[PDB]
Design a protein around this ligand. Structure first.
Ligand SMILES: CN(Cc1cccc(F)c1)S(N)(=O)=O
Length: 284
């Protein structure tokens, strides 16, 4: 029996290394990672890898790892796949903990835009969780935290994190993580997976996939939102991604909106993440 070494980047930036039989399906690796993380509520999570385009792909747990990574290194990242719309309803604190770690990276990366005050408030709950009660001895008027809070850091943001941290005295890590999530879950891009596309007129848009449905972001004045109940069907042909939208009451025919993706793989990727989120919505 021949085993391949897997390297997984965990959400605190640490690296986990294990071996699986070379014909292993994704689930085998994932089960090992989740056991290492003491994670039971595993269905919200997944493993990603990067292809030679350095684009992110979900490792399909049902398929052989080798037929997915193909020519690439057996190098993966552990990630939230399905963002819970109501994290307070997860059964375990450790589940909320990993969700917070993912959202910290969503914020620092700019995937999850955040006002100055929300950056500072989220940062303040992270500090309370990671370090406990505010301690002036560590701080000082010139303090910069080790923690990454934002896509760009400013002294004003560091100061506001400390001001709000003072107000959390006595808060336990589980409580500070619940507060982090109660705030983050309300942000307009929470759990939104964005895909570059062109509309049928060739205008650059973003397609957003999330729990509630499909977002078409043309510009600030031109946004469309299709809750899952309004989406009949989706398809990809070559580089094309098509959405069928139910008729409004007393209309006879669905409408088709068409999108051009950069290539066939990007269309297939968008299709699969939409199917997977749709199946999530069905079970909520
Ligand atoms: C697997 N499908 C189900 C689906 C229905 C409605 C919305 C969806 F995002 C997915 S499909 N590819 O449309 O035939």
């Amino acid at each position: 029996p021949k085993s391949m070494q897997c390297k997984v980047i965990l959400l605190d930036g640490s690296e986990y290394t294990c071996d699986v039989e070379k014909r292993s399906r994704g689930q085998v690796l994932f089960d090992k990672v989740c056991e290492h993380l003491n994670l039971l509520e595993k269905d919200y999570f997944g493993l990603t890898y990067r292809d030679a385009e350095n684009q992110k792909n979900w490792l399909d747990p049902a398929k052989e790892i080798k037929k997915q990574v193909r020519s690439g290194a057996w190098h993966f990242s552990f990630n939230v796949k399905f963002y819970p719309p109501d994290p307070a309803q997860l059964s375990e604190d450790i589940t909320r903990y990993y969700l917070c770690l993912q959202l910290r990276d969503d914020i620092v990366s700019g995937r999850l835009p955040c006002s100055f005050v929300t950056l500072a408030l989220l940062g303040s709950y992270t500090v309370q969780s990671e370090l406990g009660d505010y301690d002036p001895d560590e701080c000082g008027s010139d303090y910069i935290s080790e923690f990454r809070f934002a896509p760009n850091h400013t002294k004003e943001l560091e100061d506001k994190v400390i001001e709000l941290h003072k107000s959390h005295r006595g808060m336990t890590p589980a409580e500070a993580e619940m507060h982090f999530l109660e705030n983050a879950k309300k942000l307009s891009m929470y759990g939104v997976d964005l895909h570059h596309a062109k509309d049928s007129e060739g205008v650059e848009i973003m397609l957003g996939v999330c729990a509630s449905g499909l977002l078409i972001y043309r510009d600030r004045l031109r946004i469309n939102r299709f809750a899952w109940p309004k989406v009949l069907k989706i398809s990809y042909k070559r580089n094309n991604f098509y959405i069928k939208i139910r008729p409004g009451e007393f209309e006879q025919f669905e409408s088709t909106i068409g999108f051009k993706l950069p290539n066939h793989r990007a269309a297939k990727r968008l299709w699969k993440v939409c199917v997977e989120h749709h199946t999530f919505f069905r079970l909520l």
